[PDB]
RNA sequence: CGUCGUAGUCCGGAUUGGAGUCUGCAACUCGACUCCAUGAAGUCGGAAUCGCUAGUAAUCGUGGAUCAGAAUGCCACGGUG
RNA sequence: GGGUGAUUAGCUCAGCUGGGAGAGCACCUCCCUACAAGGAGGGGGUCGGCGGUUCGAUCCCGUCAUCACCCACCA
RNA sequence: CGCGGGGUGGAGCAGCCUGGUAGCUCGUCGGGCUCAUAACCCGAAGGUCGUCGGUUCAAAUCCGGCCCCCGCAACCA
RNA sequence: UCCUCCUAAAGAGUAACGGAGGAGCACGAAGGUUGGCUAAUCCUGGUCGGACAUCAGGAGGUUAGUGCAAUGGCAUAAGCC
């Protein structure tokens, strides 16, 4: 199951993760739904979140999966991290490759409040 | 025959022989043989031993044996100036302490264990005790 | 496509209560068809073999290419590396094309047609399904009259016992046991 | 006696060599390595040996 | 071009893959050639333009391989599926036609290195 | 050749105990080519390329004495 | 007269096969005949070696006994020379 | 008891970047005449066994058999 | 950093210093000859020279390299 | 001379001409990095098909693997594409 294959392409990027300390973005999807979450330093809080999931988000789409779907919690993420004062962070990808959907959520982060 | 398959490792050397054993209470059949004493015993003791418990029951039982050696000795025929290296294996041992029980019958009256298990005293470096099932 | 969708519309879907099933995801399918050739030892001169799978490649849409042993230590007396077969494995796309000339017809050249074994066991639904020997379709440069060639036809399916793909197998012009 | 020891030259132009060992028994193709060198700054290919 | 063969005529006379197809031998195809117009001058391997048609009516016209021998999936249990010494000796590699085995034993059935 | 030479068993082992450290370095056990249970923490790497153990801090060393497996790793905290 | 220009050949025939025809107490086994289907080996041959006289040698034809049927064995008769 | 080596076709023996084993004799059939010598045609071995190492073992590793040698210990 | 020569059909060795032209002697094989085998005799088969470039109209033949293989000697940690 | 595991004692050092075995070099790659991938071996059916390698299915081992030996780490792969 890719679930079961994700984790062997994320657990040497978060053991290297618990090396470098701070928050994690925290990105993440589902062929139906995308996510972002700012999670603390040891892990106990999370701070802000965005999702295709919420309400407003959801029907101001499409399709709650696509590139255009990512890009809209990438600008919800931003917005909500910048808020909180966030900059000078790593981009944490939950073991998905970073092409396409993940892409298109960083690029739109990048004029709405977070770069990397 | 009576040896652990070879491995390139053979020159084993003598340990420290210590009091406790865990196995106690038959296990195969109702009449056993038990150590309560300690030291050593060779592959070819402990099949004479066997050898006078076959020839005092012959077919009225079947013989049990928890015993199968698991160091060989390291010998030379005479005395040497000192020295060169480790001599090569001759004999093979197995070691005993007084918890362990050695062997075990079943298909015999008390009174025949009691005599066939008598038979092999002789041949053995401790003096031994009969054991019962005792069961309640 | 030519046919491909009544592979999942219709196939077995009508018969699912002879086997007590109620969901359309209890029902087989097909995964892929893999192919195997009768390599014949060949290494001297090896053109031939490299001519056959030319002509393997002209009944698959994939890039001819090499299989190799699991073992590099075998009862066989084995090396290192060694190429065992060549697959050409068929696929959605490629596999619906490979059906409009294979698996349905081999009566363009004869002599008995009623002889050979028809014949698998597996436990969980996958076939071998071959009927054997060519009939040859009408190319260029096609005149060598080359001889010892055989191609191994099996299936995989998401079945889940040996009935559920003698089932499933019906959708092809399969002659079955007596 | 198997190995011979080269001589390699900067593709920038050093009276200098790179110092190295390579195949001479069954291998006739050639050895060539980027290299620094503080005289031309920029990390260049030494090549052919001399 | 391919009609009745799978073989092609390179240097050799146009008796190859016209002989030898499983229902046409040597003398059969030379008159297939001759009622179709085709003559022996210059020893030809590559055919007239259309030639081919006039050719393939006179082939097409006798029976080859499974039309030749068209009941053999019925024949076979006299042979097969009941006792028959006939085709036991078959399946042991030796022939049934009173062959003198003292003279006729070669290499396809059993060496001779 | 060949002939049984044996070699030299060559330190490991321990340097000290209790929380060391105060000058420049946290210098742990000095066992060689270790990669299986002792360790330092993430938020505070060291080591070199034989895997002796050290952490990069000029304090005191605390333990973290808990993780997977059997790993308990050498940390930092301010005192 | 027609034809190949030297090709494992329009060469070559053993085998694997079909369907009919005849005799006979009876031909699966241990026969002949016919018309057809597959068509290998063989490219003039180890150490070497046989024979010869004038209508003869050479070579191509014809007949007959043994039979109900059945020889490349057996015995005989012409052309050309 | 302990140690160094030899064992490859019916015979004598070559054979280690180990990789699917070979010649000369001999023998069969023959040539010559009924044989010998020898010319021509032709076959191949658990590489003494067992059990391992190895991509591959006749060869390396531990052992048993068959065969030869070294030793009863310096004063 | 120092040393002379060879590689020619299957061996052996000429030919190379004459640029244009392949040789001697064995072996291998076909015939010829005989009471065996063989020997001998008359013929035949195998050749742009280890190999890659350069000089030139032209390279076995003149020059530079790489590999196989064998002598000799000065400085050489 | 050097080196992996052990004698060696809940620091080191260390016995003896002690037990099992390596190094004196090789690959410009097995170095640097991005991303992907997952490993003994056994059984059964189907075949080319000479037990078993293969094609697929079922079972099970991070005991597979690493330029070299040893020992431990390791799929988070430092293992191979």
């Given at each position: ?34 996510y ?77 409040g977070?770069?990397? | ?16 022989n ?57 010998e ?60 309640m | ?13 009508k ?41 393997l ?54 002599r008995?047609?009623?002889?050979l ?13 071959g009927?054997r ?46 | ?50 | 071009?391919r ?61 080859v ?49 | ?79």
């Open positions: 199951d890719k679930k079961s294959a994700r984790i062997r392409r994320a657990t040497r990027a978060r053991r290297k993760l618990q090396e470098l300390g701070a928050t994690r973005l925290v990105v993440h999807r589902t062929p139906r739904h995308i972002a979450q700012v999670i603390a330093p040891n892990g106990s809080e999370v701070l802000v979140a965005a999702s295709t999931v919420e309400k407003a988000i959801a029907e101001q789409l499409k399709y709650t999966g696509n590139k255009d779907a990512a890009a809209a919690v990438g600008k919800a993420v931003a917005e909500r991290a910048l808020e909180k004062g966030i900059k000078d962070v790593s981009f944490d990808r939950s073991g998905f490759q970073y092409h396409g959907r993940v892409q298109a959520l960083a690029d739109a982060a990048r004029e709405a977070l770069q990397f | 025959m009576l040896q652990p398959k070879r491995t390139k490792f053979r020159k084993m050397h003598k340990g420290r210590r009091g406790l054993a865990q196995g106690t209470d038959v296990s195969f059949g109702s009449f056993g043989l038990k150590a309560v004493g300690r030291g050593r015993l060779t592959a070819r003791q402990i099949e004479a031993a066997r050898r006078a418990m076959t020839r005092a029951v012959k077919r009225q039982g079947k013989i049990w044996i928890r015993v199968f050696p698991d160091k060989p000795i390291t030379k025929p005479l005395a040497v100036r000192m020295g060169k290296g480790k001599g090569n294996v001759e004999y093979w041992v197995a070691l005993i302490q007084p918890g362990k029980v050695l062997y075990e019958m079943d298909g015999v009256p008390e009174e025949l264990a009691r005599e066939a298990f008598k038979l092999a005293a002789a041949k053995l470096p401790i003096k031994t005790t009969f054991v019962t099932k005792t069961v | 496509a030519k046919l491909h969708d009544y592979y999942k519309d219709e196939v077995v879907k018969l699912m209560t002879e086997f007590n099933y109620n969901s359309v995801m209890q029902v087989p399918r097909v995964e892929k068809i893999t192919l195997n050739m009768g390599v014949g030892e060949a290494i001297a001169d090896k053109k031939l073999l490299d001519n056959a799978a030319a002509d490649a002209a009944i698959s849409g994939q890039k001819p290419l090499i299989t190799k042993a699991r073992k590099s230590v075998a009862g066989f007396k084995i090396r290192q590396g060694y190429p065992i077969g060549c697959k050409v494995t068929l696929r959605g796309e490629r596999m619906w094309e490979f059906f409009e000339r294979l698996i349905t017809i081999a009566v363009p050249r004869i008995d047609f009623r002889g074994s028809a014949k698998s066991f597996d436990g969980r639904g996958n076939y071998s399904m009927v020997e060519q009939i040859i379709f009408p190319e260029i440069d096609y005149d060598k009259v080359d001889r010892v060639r055989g191609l191994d036809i099996t299936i995989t399916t998401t079945a889940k016992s040996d009935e559920e793909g003698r089932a499933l197998l019906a959708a092809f012009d399969f002659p079955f046991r007596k | 006696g198997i190995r011979e020891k080269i001589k390699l030259v900067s593709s920038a132009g050093t009276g200098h060599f790179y110092t190295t060992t390579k195949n001479k028994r069954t291998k006739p193709e050639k050895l060539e390595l980027k290299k620094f060198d503080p005289v031309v700054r920029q990390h260049v290919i030494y090549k052919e040996a001399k | 071009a009609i009745a063969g799978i073989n092609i005529p390179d240097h050799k006379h146009a008796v190859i893959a016209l002989t030898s197809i499983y229902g046409v031998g040597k003398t059969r195809s030379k008159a297939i050639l001759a009622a179709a117009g085709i003559a022996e001058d210059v020893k030809i391997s590559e055919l007239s333009e259309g030639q081919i048609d006039t050719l393939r009516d006179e082939v097409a016209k006798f029976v391989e499974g039309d030749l021998r068209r009941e053999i999936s019925m024949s076979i249990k006299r042979l097969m599926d009941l006792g028959c010494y006939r085709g036991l000796r078959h399946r042991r590699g030796l022939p049934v036609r009173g062959q003198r085995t003292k003279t006729n034993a070669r290499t396809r059935k059993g060496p001779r290195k | 050749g060949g002939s049984t030479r044996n070699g030299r068993d060559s330190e490991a082992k321990r340097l000290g105990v209790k929380r060391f450290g105060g000058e420049s370095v946290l210098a742990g056990s000095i066992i060689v080519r270790q990669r299986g249970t002792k360790f330092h923490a993430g938020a505070n790497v060291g080591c070199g390329r034989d895997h002796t153990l050290f952490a990069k801090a000029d304090g005191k060393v605390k333990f973290e004495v808990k993780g997977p497996k059997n790993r308990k790793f050498i940390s930092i905290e301010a005192e």
